Amino acid sequence: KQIVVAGALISRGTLLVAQRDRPAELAGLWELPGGKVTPGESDADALARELREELGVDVAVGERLGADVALNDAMTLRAYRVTLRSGSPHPHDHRALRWVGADEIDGLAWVPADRAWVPDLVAALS
């Protein structure tokens, strides 16, 4: 299986979420940002790489957040806690970014796969 890694960046008590711009089925919906692990990379390497490219930040990759999500037979999606080392996030690849609190997480129009993590994210912010 192909692994897709995603980051739950919590800073100053809020969670960063990212609004996809593609493909049409997901454009406008919100996600934890990340991307595919390439063969030869660790999960930490891949996630830090993706968030540097997508957001313009250097992060440290920490513990898993929640369980794996099966995207299909082909791919699996995994979230990690990440924390900021340097930089301020900007939507280089996404439509928008938002910092959200616990109360806002269940109301967000999540991409269907990431929605599974709602209870985990609420707990992390509580």
Between 36 and 85, CB nearer to ligand DCM: 36
- Out of 16, 31, 59, 105, the residue judged to bind ligand DCM by CB under 6 A: 31
User: Position 47: which residue type?
Assistant: L
CA distances from 100 to 31, 64, 97, 103 (A): 12, 20, 10, 8
Task: Determine if 91 is a binding residue for ligand DCM (CB under 6 A).
Answer: no
Q: Per rule CB under 6 A, is residue 6 in the interface with ligand DCM? A: yes
4 binds ligand DCM, rule: CB under 6 A: yes
Which of 9-17, 27-35, 55-63, 98-106 is the region at the interface with ligand DCM (rule: CB under 6 A)?
Answer: 27-35
What does DSSP say about strands 2-11 and 75-86: parallel, antiparallel, or unpaired? parallel
Among 8, 32, 57, 121, binds ligand DCM (CB under 6 A): 32
- Sequence-distant (6+) residues with CB within 8 A of 41 are 49
Q: What DSSP letter does each residue of 48-114 carry, written as one string?
A: HHHHHHHHS-EEEEEEEEEEEEE-SSSEEEEEEEEEEEE-----SSSSEEEEE-HHHHTTS-B-TTG
Residue 32 Cβ vs ligand DCM, minimum distance, rounded to whole Å: 5
Query: Within 71-90, which residues bind ligand DCM (CB under 6 A)?
Result: 71, 77
Instruction: Summarize as ranges the residues that interact with ligand DCM (CB under 6 A).
Output: 4, 6, 31-32, 34-36, 71, 77, 111, 113-114
